[PDB]
C-alpha cells in the first residue's frame, strides 16, 4: 500500500574504510549458514540445524582510482547506509573485517566505461541503524 | 559552552517514560501545591507533574496524575482547584540594625498553598556582609545559599535561582540593613488546597478547561453527586455547541450492587462512563471515582485503533465481584466493572452509561469505542473550516474539491484498518431543495470487527 | 560481607523437599497459630509451614499440610480458619518505680491466637538499666535478649527481632521507668482457633480463597456435611463462571459401607471426589477426609502426564477392606478406596464422584485423570485472553492467527506424549450463521492409553 | 592542609576534565574511630585514604607512605586487576580489628591492610566515597570502578586530536564517530574487561540538539570478578 | 558528481614485452587469493585468512600478425597504462612473468574479422603509477 515505505538505490552512501565511495554501481552482501543437515533412526524428515556463519560481498563500480589495487589483501570495513526520504528512517550495517579475494588490476573494454568489480568475505556484522 | 568531549555518566533510575502515548486529557486537580489560575500541559514524563505538583501521595494531584500517566496519555492539561479563601503563605523579615525592627522582604509562596513550608535566615560565616538563607519542605530542604546582606542582592538571589520555586521574594523598601535571624518559620495566609473543594471553584475550572479540547474528561475522581450533575450540563452544553467531551465518573464504596446499576441506568448520555468498582496498586486503594481517572486515560491512549473492552490495567486486586448472570445484568444496566481474571485486573466491556437504547437508534452506539470514533471523525471533518468555509465557492468544483478532501480523510483513515469500507458522496435528496450557500453531503462506514466472544466446541 | 572463604559445615538433618513437584492447591487451614485473614503460599519446603503454622500434630494446620506437602503438590496456599470470637493473645505490661503501677507496653500476638504463649521479664544483672526479656511456647524458650529499661528501645527490639515472630510490643505511653518483673504470664484475650469451627468462617475463607486459581480444592479435611454442601455451591458456581476447582472430600467413619456408597452416588458433580476409607501413617491415624488432602495433593501433582489409580501412597495402613464383588459395586457407586496390596497402600482406581453416567455422555469423563484434563485444557486455551480478545481483528488472517496458536498449544502438548493425534479448525457449520464480533471453532484430540488391566494365560 | 590543597587540585582537575586519582594516608595518632571518620569525612570519588602502617625488610613505612606502594599497585594494576586482596611486598602491618569492626570500617570508607598469612594482603578494594546514596549506584564506590570509568572517559576524550573541527555533523560524519566509539569498545572487549556493551545516538536529546551539537549513549557490562565463596560442608 | 573521474576505455595503452599493442579490444587482469577457511571449537563464524596469490590475465583483440604464436609459452611483461584526458592523472600496472596458457593458432570465421584471444598467469604485479 504504502508508496513511502519503498527504498530506491539512489539513497545510498557507501564508506570504504571510513572515507566515502562515491562511484559504485550496486553492492551485494550475504552472510550465509553452513547449515547441517540431521537425520534420525525413528523420525522421516530432516533436521537442519546452524553451523557457522561466513560473510561474502560483492561490489561492483565505476573505476577512478587504484584504491583496491594499493588496498591489497588488507583487512577494511564496510558502512552501508540506506536512507528514506519520504520516511526520515534509514539502515546503517557494518561489514568487520571485509576481505578481498582477488584484485582488480586490469579491466577494460575497446569504447566503454572503466569499471571495477571486487568480491571478498567478511567475519560478522554490526546492525548500527535500521 | 566550548568544543570538546564532556562523558557524563547518569544513574539508571533516571529513566524516560514510555513512546507509545497518545491522546489528551484533562484533569482539575485538586493540587495542595501548583499552580493557580491556568491550566499546564504535561507532556509524557512524569517529572514536570511531580516538580509542579507535589510529590506527596495523599494529593489528589500527584495520585491521580500518576494514574492518567501510567494510563499512558500523551498530553495531561492539569488545572489547580483551590478555594476562593485558599490563598499563598507568607511571610516578612525584618532587620536587627536599630532598635524596633522594620519589614524589608515579603517571602510569598510562588503559587496559593498553606503546606508546611519553611524558612530560616543565619549570618554567614565566610563573610560578615553575607548571610544564609535556607529553606525547608516537610523537614527537606529545598534551597540553601549565601548572599551579600544587602536587599537588592537577597530578592534577586531568591527570584532568581531555580531552587526558589515554592517562594517569591519582593523588597518591601529599599535598605543593606543585616536582616533579623529567624529558625524555622512557616509560610502562613491560605488554606490547603484539597480542603474545602466547592462546586462553583470546579464549575470556574471549567470554565478554564473550556480554553482547549480534550478527548476526555475525568473530573479529578470526585464522586459527589453535585459535581456530577455540574460537570454532565457542561457537557452536554458543549456537545451542543459542537465540543465532543466523553466524561468519565465513578460511584461511591458505600453503593451496592442494585444502586450502582440504578446510578448507572440514572445517566442516559452516550459521552458519561461510570466506574462502579474500586481497585488496590501498589498496595494503596482507589475509590472508583479515582480509578476513573485512569479509566479515561488508558481510553484516550488506545483513542482510535484499540478499545478499553479487556486491557491489562494495572491494578492487582478489585472489589466488588459479581457472578455472570449478575454481570450481565449490571452491563445491561451500564456499569462499567473491573474483574481480577488473572494476576492482573482486566476491564470487563468497553460499555458506556448508554448502554439502555431504544428501537429507533442503533445498539453499536452504546460503546465507548463507537463514541470515541463518532467524536474523532466529527472532529476531524469538523476541523476542515480554516481554509474551506467563506473561503471557498459553491458550484460544482468547490464542492468536487470538498468531497476530494473528506475522501482523503476517509481514506487515509482506511490506511489504519479502522474502517473495512466507506463513501461519500453529494446528498442529492436534500442539496436539490437547498440553500444557494448550503452544502450537503452524506457518508457511510463500515467498522472492522474485532473478536470478543469465542466459543470452543471439544470431543473426545 | 568481605571478600573470603567462609567454610560453614550444616547439619545432615536439615535437607531440603524433593524437587519433582507440581501443580496448586488450596489449603482452609484450622491453625491454632497462623496468618488470619490472608493466603500465604508456600513452596515446596515444610519450613515456612511449621515456622508459619506451629510445628503441633493436633494442630490441623500442621498435620494436613505435611500431608499435602508429602503429596508433593509444587505450591500449596494455606488460609488459616478461626473463629469470629478468636482473637490475639494480649498482655499489658507495667513499671514499679511510682507507688502505683501504670501500664507501659501492650504484648499482643502477631497474629490472633490463644496458645501457650508466656512472658517473663526480669533485671539485667550486666546492667542495672537493662532488663532480660525472654518469651516460651508451651515451656520452650523462643526469645531471649537484654535491651535498656527504655521502653523505646525494648518496644523496638521487641518488633525488631525475628525470634518475637508470635509477639508485637507497642508503647502505650512515653516512658523509660523500670519495667514490673513477671514470670510465665500467659497471653490471653482470644480462642484456640481449631475451635468453634464454623461455617460462615469457611465462607469468608472461600472467599479469600477466590483471590487466586487453584488445581484442587481440599476443604482442610472436614468432614461436616453443611461444609461439604457449602463448598460444592462453591466449586459449582465457581465452574459456571468459568473458574475450574477439583473438590476433594472424604466420608466419615461412623458410614458403613453401604452409607459411603449411597453418600458417593448422592454426588453426581464431575469436579467432586470422595474418599471412603481412613488410614494410618507412623502410627497416627487419619479420617477419610483427612487423607483426601493427601489425595488431593497426589493428584494435582500428578496434574497432567499422571494418575492415581494404583499410585504408591505413603500410608502404611487402611480401612475397611471388600472383596473383589464389593470393590466393582463400591467403584461403581464412585467411591474411592484405599487398598493395602502389599507393604505400602495404593489406590484401587482413579474415579471421581461422576461414575454413575448417562446415555448422552461418554463414560472416559468419570475419571479424575480426564476431569484434570479437561480442566486443564479448557483453562490453557483460555487463557489466550490477555493478547487475544479485544486486541485482534476477525478477518481470516486474525482467525488463521488463532488457530496457530491454539494448534501450537496442542502441538507443544503432544510433545509430552499426552495426546496421540489432535484436529484444530474453524467450526463452518456455526460460523456460518455466526455474528460478525463471534469466532466459533472446533477441535478433536485422543488422549494416550495407559495400561490398566493385564491379562496372563499360563500354561504347563 | 597539604591533603585538602591536593584534594581542591584534583576537583579542579576534574571539574576541567583531567582525571587523577588521589592517594593519601592516615598519621599514627589516628585511632580507629578516628580515622574512620577521616574517612567518612572525604566523599569524593577519587581520593583514597590508607588508616594502617606497615613494616617491609624490617624499615616501617606510615599509612601515608604506604599510601605510595597502594597506589603504584593500583596504577600498575590500572585496568584488567584489582588491589582488593592482591599480594603486598609488605611483611607486617597495625593495627588490627574484628571481621565486625573491619565492616564498620570498610563502611567507613577506610584501606586497611592486612597479615593474612606471611605476607601482607588487602581487605577490599574501596575508596572514600564508599558512602554512596539512593541517587546514585554503590559499584562506583570501588577503586577499580573510578579508574575504569576514568580510562573510559579519557579514551573517548582522547578521540578529539583529529575528530573535533575535523569532521562533519551529519549522518556519515557521526556515523563514522560511532564506528570509532565502537571499535574503542570492541577492543576493550577484546581483554575481557567488558561482557556487553552498546553504542548508538541519544535520539532522545539529538532530536532537540543544535546543528554543531553531537550527542551520543554508551552501556557497558563489566565482568564480574569472584570476591565472596561459601563452602557447605558434610561428612 | 565529478563527469571527469570516469576513465573511458580509449585512455588505454598496451605494452607487450616492450612494444606497444594498438590492435587490442579489451584486456583483463585478477590476483585471486587461495584463500583459507578456518572454523574454531570454541567460535560459531569461519575466520579468513589469506593464502598464496595468483594472477589470471586474458586479452582480447585483432589478428594482424603472428606475435602470440612465435611468442609461444615463454616469459613476457604487461605494461598496461590508463590514462585520464580531463586530469592529468594516470594509472599504470606492470604485470610480471606473464606467460600464455594457450596459443591461439587459429581462429577465423567465415565474414567476419578475425580476432585472437589469449588468457594466461602472472606471477606479480607492479603499481608503477596511479
Same mark, same amino acid.
Given at each position: 500500500?504504502e508508496?513511502a515505505?519503498?527504498?530506491?538505490?539512489?539513497?545510498v552512501?557507501i564508506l570504504?574504510?571510513?572515507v566515502?565511495?562515491?562511484?559504485m554501481?550496486?553492492?551485494?552482501?550475504?552472510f550465509?549458514?553452513?547449515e547441517?543437515?540431521? $537425520?534420525l533412526?525413528?523420525?522421516q524428515?530432516?533436521? !537442519?540445524?546452524?553451523?557457522?556463519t $561466513?560473510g561474502?560481498?560483492?561490489?561492483?563500480?565505476?573505476?577512478t582510482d587504484s584504491?583496491?589495487?594499493?588496498?591489497?589483501?588488507?583487512?577494511?570495513?564496510?558502512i552501508?547506509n540506506l536512507?528514506?526520504?519520504?520516511?526520515?528512517?534509514?539502515?546503517?550495517?557494518?561489514?568487520?573485517?571485509?576481505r578481498?579475494?582477488?584484485?582488480?588490476?586490469?579491466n !577494460? $573494454?575497446?569504447?566503454?566505461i572503466?569499471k571495477?568489480?571486487v568480491?571478498? !568475505?567478511?567475519?560478522?556484522?554490526d546492525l548500527?541503524?535500521e | 559552552?566550548?568544543?570538546g568531549?564532556?562523558?557524563?555518566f %547518569?544513574?539508571?533510575?533516571?529513566?524516560?517514560?514510555?513512546?507509545?502515548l497518545?491522546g489528551r486529557?484533562?484533569?482539575?486537580?485538586?493540587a495542595n501545591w501548583?499552580?493557580?489560575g491556568k491550566?499546564v500541559?504535561?507532556?509524557?514524563?512524569?517529572?514536570q507533574?511531580k516538580?509542579?505538583?507535589?510529590?506527596?501521595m495523599?494529593?489528589s494531584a500527584f495520585?491521580?496524575?500518576?494514574?492518567?500517566?501510567?494510563?499512558?496519555?500523551?498530553?495531561?492539561?492539569?488545572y489547580?482547584?483551590?478555594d476562593?479563601?485558599?490563598?499563598?503563605?507568607?511571610?516578612?523579615?525584618?532587620?536587627t540594625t536599630e532598635?524596633?525592627?522594620?519589614?524589608?522582604?515579603?517571602?510569598?509562596?510562588?503559587?496559593?498553598?498553606?503546606?508546611?513550608?519553611?524558612?530560616?535566615?543565619k549570618?554567614?560565616?565566610?563573610?560578615?556582609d553575607?548571610?544564609?538563607?535556607?529553606?525547608f519542605?516537610?523537614?527537606k530542604?529545598?534551597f +540553601?545559599?549565601?548572599? %551579600?546582606?544587602?536587599?537588592?542582592?537577597?530578592?534577586?538571589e531568591?527570584? +532568581?535561582?531555580?531552587?526558589n520555586?515554592?517562594?517569591i521574594?519582593?523588597?518591601?523598601?529599599?535598605?543593606?540593613?543585616?536582616?533579623?535571624?529567624?529558625?524555622?518559620?512557616?509560610?502562613?495566609?491560605?488554606?490547603?488546597? &484539597?480542603?474545602?473543594?466547592?462546586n462553583?471553584?470546579y464549575? %470556574?475550572?471549567l470554565?478554564?478547561?473550556?480554553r482547549?479540547?480534550?478527548?476526555?474528561?475525568?473530573?479529578d475522581?470526585?464522586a459527589d453527586?453535585?459535581?456530577?450533575?455540574?460537570?454532565?450540563?457542561?457537557?452536554?452544553?458543549? %456537545?451542543?455547541?459542537g465540543?465532543?467531551?466523553?466524561?468519565?465518573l465513578?460511584?461511591?464504596?458505600?453503593?451496592n450492587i442494585?444502586?450502582?446499576?440504578d446510578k448507572s441506568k440514572?445517566?442516559?448520555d452516550?459521552?458519561?462512563?461510570n466506574?462502579g468498582?474500586s481497585?488496590?496498586?501498589?498496595?494503596?486503594?482507589?475509590?472508583?471515582?479515582?480509578?476513573?481517572?485512569?479509566?479515561?486515560?488508558?481510553?484516550?491512549?488506545?483513542?482510535?485503533?484499540?478499545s478499553? &473492552?479487556?486491557?491489562?490495567?494495572?491494578?492487582e486486586?478489585?472489589?466488588p465481584?459479581l457472578?455472570?448472570?449478575?454481570?450481565?445484568? &449490571?452491563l445491561?444496566?451500564?456499569?462499567?466493572?473491573?474483574?481480577?481474571?488473572?494476576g492482573?485486573?482486566i476491564?470487563?466491556?468497553?460499555?458506556?452509561?448508554?448502554?439502555?437504547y431504544?428501537?429507533?437508534?442503533?445498539?453499536?452506539?452504546?460503546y465507548?469505542?463507537?463514541?470515541?470514533?463518532?467524536?474523532?471523525?466529527?472532529?476531524d471533518?469538523?476541523?476542515?473550516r480554516?481554509?474551506?468555509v467563506?473561503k471557498?465557492?459553491?458550484?460544482?468544483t468547490?464542492?468536487?474539491?470538498?468531497? &476530494?478532501?473528506?475522501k482523503?480523510?476517509?481514506?487515509?483513515?482506511?490506511?489504519?484498518?479502522?474502517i473495512s469500507?466507506f463513501?461519500v458522496?453529494?446528498?442529492?435528496?436534500?442539496?436539490a431543495?437547498a440553500?444557494?450557500?448550503?452544502?450537503y453531503?452524506?457518508?457511510?462506514?463500515?467498522?472492522?470487527?474485532?473478536?470478543?466472544?469465542?466459543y470452543?466446541?471439544?470431543?473426545?
Amino acid at each position: 500500500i504504502e508508496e513511502a515505505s519503498f527504498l530506491n538505490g539512489s539513497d545510498v552512501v557507501i564508506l570504504i574504510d571510513g572515507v566515502e565511495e562515491l562511484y559504485m554501481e550496486e553492492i551485494k552482501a550475504d552472510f550465509e549458514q553452513d547449515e547441517q543437515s540431521i $537425520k534420525l533412526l525413528g523420525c522421516q524428515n530432516e533436521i !537442519s540445524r546452524v553451523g557457522t556463519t $561466513k560473510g561474502s560481498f560483492s561490489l561492483n563500480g565505476y573505476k577512478t582510482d587504484s584504491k583496491f589495487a594499493k588496498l591489497g589483501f588488507r583487512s577494511f570495513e564496510i558502512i552501508y547506509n540506506l536512507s528514506n526520504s519520504e520516511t526520515l528512517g534509514y539502515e546503517s550495517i557494518r561489514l568487520k573485517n571485509c576481505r578481498l579475494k582477488k584484485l582488480p588490476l586490469i579491466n !577494460s $573494454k575497446a569504447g566503454e566505461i572503466v569499471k571495477i568489480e571486487v568480491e571478498g !568475505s567478511f567475519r560478522g556484522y554490526d546492525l548500527l541503524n535500521e | 559552552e566550548i568544543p570538546g568531549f564532556y562523558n557524563r555518566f %547518569k544513574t539508571q533510575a533516571e529513566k524516560s517514560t514510555n513512546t507509545g502515548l497518545k491522546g489528551r486529557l484533562a484533569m482539575p486537580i485538586r493540587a495542595n501545591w501548583g499552580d493557580v489560575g491556568k491550566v499546564v500541559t504535561i507532556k509524557n514524563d512524569l517529572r514536570q507533574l511531580k516538580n509542579l505538583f507535589g510529590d506527596d501521595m495523599n494529593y489528589s494531584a500527584f495520585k491521580l496524575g500518576k494514574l492518567a500517566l501510567l494510563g499512558n496519555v500523551k498530553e495531561l492539561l492539569l488545572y489547580r482547584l483551590v478555594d476562593g479563601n485558599q490563598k499563598k503563605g507568607t511571610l516578612t523579615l525584618k532587620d536587627t540594625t536599630e532598635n524596633s525592627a522594620k519589614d524589608v522582604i515579603k517571602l510569598e509562596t510562588k503559587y496559593p498553598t498553606a503546606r508546611n513550608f519553611n524558612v530560616t535566615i543565619k549570618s554567614n560565616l565566610v563573610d560578615s556582609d553575607k548571610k544564609d538563607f535556607i529553606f525547608f519542605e516537610n523537614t527537606k530542604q529545598l534551597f +540553601s545559599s549565601s548572599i %551579600k546582606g544587602t536587599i537588592d542582592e537577597i530578592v534577586l538571589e531568591i527570584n +532568581s535561582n531555580l531552587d526558589n520555586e515554592y517562594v517569591i521574594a519582593t523588597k518591601v523598601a529599599d535598605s543593606d540593613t543585616i536582616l533579623a535571624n529567624v529558625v524555622n518559620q512557616a509560610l502562613e495566609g491560605g488554606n490547603d488546597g &484539597c480542603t474545602s473543594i466547592t462546586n462553583e471553584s470546579y464549575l %470556574k475550572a471549567l470554565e478554564e478547561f473550556e480554553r482547549y479540547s480534550f478527548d476526555s474528561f475525568v473530573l479529578d475522581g470526585v464522586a459527589d453527586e453535585a459535581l456530577q450533575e455540574t460537570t454532565k450540563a457542561w457537557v452536554a452544553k458543549n %456537545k451542543e455547541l459542537g465540543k465532543d467531551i466523553l466524561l468519565f465518573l465513578g460511584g461511591k464504596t458505600e453503593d451496592n450492587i442494585k444502586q450502582i446499576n440504578d446510578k448507572s441506568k440514572s445517566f442516559n448520555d452516550e459521552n458519561i462512563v461510570n466506574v462502579g468498582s474500586s481497585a488496590y496498586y501498589e498496595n494503596i486503594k482507589y475509590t472508583p471515582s479515582e480509578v476513573a481517572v485512569y479509566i479515561a486515560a488508558l481510553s484516550v491512549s488506545k483513542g482510535i485503533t484499540g478499545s478499553i &473492552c479487556n486491557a491489562k490495567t494495572i491494578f492487582e486486586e478489585v472489589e466488588p465481584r459479581l457472578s455472570q448472570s449478575e454481570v450481565k445484568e &449490571c452491563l445491561k444496566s451500564g456499569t462499567l466493572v473491573l474483574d481480577f481474571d488473572d494476576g492482573d485486573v482486566i476491564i470487563v466491556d468497553d460499555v458506556n452509561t448508554f448502554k439502555k437504547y431504544v428501537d429507533d437508534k442503533n445498539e453499536a452506539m452504546g460503546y465507548i469505542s463507537n463514541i470515541m470514533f463518532i467524536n474523532t471523525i466529527n472532529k476531524d471533518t469538523s476541523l476542515k473550516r480554516k481554509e474551506f468555509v467563506g473561503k471557498i465557492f459553491n458550484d460544482a468544483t468547490g464542492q468536487t474539491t470538498v468531497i &476530494c478532501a473528506l475522501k482523503k480523510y476517509f481514506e487515509e483513515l482506511m490506511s489504519q484498518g479502522i474502517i473495512s469500507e466507506f463513501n461519500v458522496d453529494i446528498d442529492t435528496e436534500l442539496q436539490a431543495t437547498a440553500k444557494a450557500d448550503e452544502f450537503y453531503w452524506k457518508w457511510d462506514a463500515v467498522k472492522v470487527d474485532v473478536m470478543k466472544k469465542i466459543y470452543g466446541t471439544g470431543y473426545l
